[PDB]
Ligand binder design. Structure first.
Ligand code: Q8Y
Ligand code: K
Ligand code: K
Length: 546
DNA sequence: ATGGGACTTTTTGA
DNA sequence: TTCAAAAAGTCCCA
């Protein structure tokens, strides 16, 4: 339903927009929260406004109607002309209306600008000086399909495919912000790097000046909520400089109440600060300090190939109901399944650097079951146990897929070959050579080398550089940060990784072969692997001139 | 009970 | 026909 923003963040966002407002020049500022809820932001806006008017009451009295500008009239003026809110939930609006009314503690029917409505559909009849708040976050699975049709038709500039509802709130906030106005919101951080956020990033960069980005990375800002947050402050002021302040957290384990204010935390050693030229932003926003930019640019300039140039990428199997098709390799039910139907099956946790654990699970590649009479035992006793849920998959409702078939069985011959596999979400680079024809779900991605690039790049060389500390840091510069100690390792970024080939190729490959050989023996002395990795990292840093 | 850690399905638009 | 993206993740315990 409704999510509670921490008070320290609310106060920071309100101060960000109002701390330098010239109330003498403009005593009628319009401040709007478009998903105000119970008024976490708007009630704080009231307090800031009240002090602002009271500190300058005599100056306003002298400059303007001296009967209008009294301390006793500040409450009425704020509610009539300054505070605006919208929310879909009428109970929240009712509570906020009482809270705003009780700030005074009837005289005559004071009107409060609170709208119970869908903020994305409301005919907004004027623009606003300042916009603050915390919009709803709803992804592609959890957003109602009927509503998505409206968003795709009307918010197509920021919303396509797997985009999120809060993209549209960025759009609406920008569109109804007054010229010279200031907006400050807390949203998920994912749009900063995600493929879905590309159009939204283009919309922001070309319509507002981004003053500041506070990136909390994987820190837990909302207690008991699995989301990662950032704060964006932007304006429509005519400026020539357009440089962004970026505050990036250093330690994700920090608790947000370290000081009384967020400014103390931002200026502390817990955060790093650097500046980014908004004019230099491409479709991607590479937000790193100068040392990392130099590091990243050296590697990009030195590497003449990308993984996409040399490799074929694919996502793993999607059965659509794992419990129906995935069995423990020691399950007695597998005696019913001819081994021609059985594939080795691994999870993301089975991928280490350079090699995969031995599989403990088997997939029934049910697409190869010819019909329901020749293998009735498998259908009745294993797969049919989940027949109702299997029939509710989209391709079964439409008749594209039989009820016992895998939803997305892919191509078997893609998996039954030497290939490289990596987990879809990890704390570090973990690229392994698969020797055992392992299948996997979508928590593991795979690629193999194009035949015309085999004489330039071997699998052993590739897992060598890809698992190095250099490439771990290099990938994480632009990688999508998901939660604490987790990055997405998806092809839309993994395949952009650039690779090189030079005089160190042979020794890097040989070091990788030694690592693999040690990792695969029984009396495993894991320690020497670390020494070999350090030597390989030195060769790689020498190659890339870092 | 909360807060922190290990781990990751299938729905969905294109 | 069939690809790949998506954390207001999910679930557990001390
Ligand atoms: O969570 C943050 C706050 O945000 C409010 N809020 C959500 N969503 C809209 C909204 N429009 C989008 C509607 C999306 C939708 C479509 C179908 C069914 C259910 C939701 N407009 C104004 N406040 C909103 C919530 O009430 C809450 O207080
Ligand atoms: K006057
Ligand atoms: K988080």
């Amino acid at each position: 339903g409704i999510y509670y923003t921490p008070k320290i963040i609310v106060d920071y966002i309100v101060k960000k927009t109002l701390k330098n407002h010239d109330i003498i020049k403009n005593p009628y500022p319009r401040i709007l929260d478009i998903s105000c809820g119970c008024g976490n932001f708007l009630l704080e806006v009231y307090d800031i406004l009240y002090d602002l008017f009271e500190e300058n009451i005599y100056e306003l009295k002298k400059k303007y109607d001296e009967n209008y500008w009294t301390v006793d009239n500040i409450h009425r003026h704020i509610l009539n002309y300054c505070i605006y809110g919208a929310d879909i939930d009428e109970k929240a609006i009712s509570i906020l209306k009482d809270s705003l009314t009780n700030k005074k503690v009837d005289e005559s029917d004071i009107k409060i600008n609170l709208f119970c409505c869908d903020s994305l559909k409301k005919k907004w009849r004027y623009k606003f000086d300042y916009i603050v708040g915390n919009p709803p976050y709803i992804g592609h699975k959890k957003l109602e399909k009927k509503y998505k049709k409206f968003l795709l038709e009307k918010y197509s500039e920021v919303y396509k495919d797997k985009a999120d509802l809060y993209f549209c709130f960025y759009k609406k906030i920008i569109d109804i912000l007054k010229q010279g106005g200031i907006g400050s919101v807390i949203t998920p951080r994912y749009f900063l790097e995600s493929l879905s956020g590309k159009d939204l990033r283009e919309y922001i960069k070309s319509n507002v000046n981004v003053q500041e980005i506070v990136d909390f990375l994987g820190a837990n800002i909302f207690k008991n909520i699995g989301v990662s947050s950032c704060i964006l402050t932007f304006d429509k002021k005519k400026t020539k400089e357009t440089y962004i302040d970026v505050f990036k957290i250093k330690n994700e384990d920090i608790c947000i109440n370290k000081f009384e204010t967020l400014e103390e935390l931002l200026k502390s050693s817990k955060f790093e600060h650097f500046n980014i030229n908004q004019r230099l932003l491409s479709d991607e926003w590479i937000l790193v300090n100068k040392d990392d930019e130099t590091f990243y640019n050296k590697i990009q300039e030195k590497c003449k190939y990308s993984l996409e140039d040399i490799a074929i990428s694919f996502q793993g199997i999607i059965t659509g109901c794992d419990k129906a098709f995935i069995l423990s390799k020691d399950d007695v039910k597998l005696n019913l399944v001819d081994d021609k139907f059985l594939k080795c099956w691994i999870k993301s946790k089975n991928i280490n650097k350079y090699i995969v654990d031995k599989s403990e699970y088997r997939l029934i590649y049910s697409n190869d079951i010819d019909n329901e009479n020749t293998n009735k035992r498998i259908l009745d006793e294993i797969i049919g146990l989940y027949k109702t849920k299997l029939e509710n998959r989209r391709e079964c409702k439409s008749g594209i897929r039989k009820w016992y078939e895998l939803q997305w069985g892919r191509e078997k011959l893609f998996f039954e070959r030497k290939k490289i596999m990596y987990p879809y979400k990890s704390n570090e680079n973990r690229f392994a050579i698969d020797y055992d024809n392992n299948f996997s779900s979508a928590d593991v991605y795979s690629f193999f080398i194009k035949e015309e690039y085999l004489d330039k790049f071997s699998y052993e060389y590739l897992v060598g550089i890809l698992n190095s500390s250099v490439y771990d840091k290099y990938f994480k510069i632009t990688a999508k940060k998901m939660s604490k100690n987790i990055y997405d390792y998806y092809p839309n970024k993994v395949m952009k990784i650039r690779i090189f080939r030079d005089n160190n190729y042979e020794e890097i490959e040989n070091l990788s072969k030694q690592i693999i050989s040690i990792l695969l023996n029984k009396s495993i002395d894991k320690g020497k692997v670390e020494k070999l990795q350090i030597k390989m990292d030195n060769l790689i840093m020498d190659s890339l001139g870092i």
